[PDB]
Design a protein around this ligand. Structure first.
Ligand code: LPU
Length: 93
């Protein structure tokens, strides 16, 4: 059975107006801004941006890759696909 989400989990993250996007649950660094209650820090591969999202918008990567892991025109997406597949736990600072 599933556990709750935890830092390092790989997902497709969905925001309004964007296709399901390769992403990870981030850690919060000591001294860094924490997300709101009930939200996780989501690092989106390719664009390297963070947003705060709840589980409803988070699709586990293994299960979802066959549907969502196809090239997309949007900026950063295809770079994103390479990252999540090839070095999803790397520092992208
Ligand atoms: C799916 S995306 O384009 O990487 N996206 C992440 C950050 C958000 O605020 C909007 C842009």
């Amino acid at each position: 059975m599933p556990h709750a989400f935890k830092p390092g989990d790989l997902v497709f993250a969905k925001m309004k107006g964007y296709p399901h996007w390769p992403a990870r649950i981030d850690d919060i660094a000591d001294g860094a801004v924490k997300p709101p209650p009930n939200k996780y820090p989501i690092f989106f591969f390719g664009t390297h941006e963070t947003a705060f999202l709840g589980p409803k918008d988070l699709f586990p990567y293994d299960k979802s890759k066959d549907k969502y892991g196809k090239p997309n025109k949007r900026k950063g997406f295809n770079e994103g696909l390479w990252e999540i597949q090839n070095n999803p736990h790397a520092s992208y600072s």
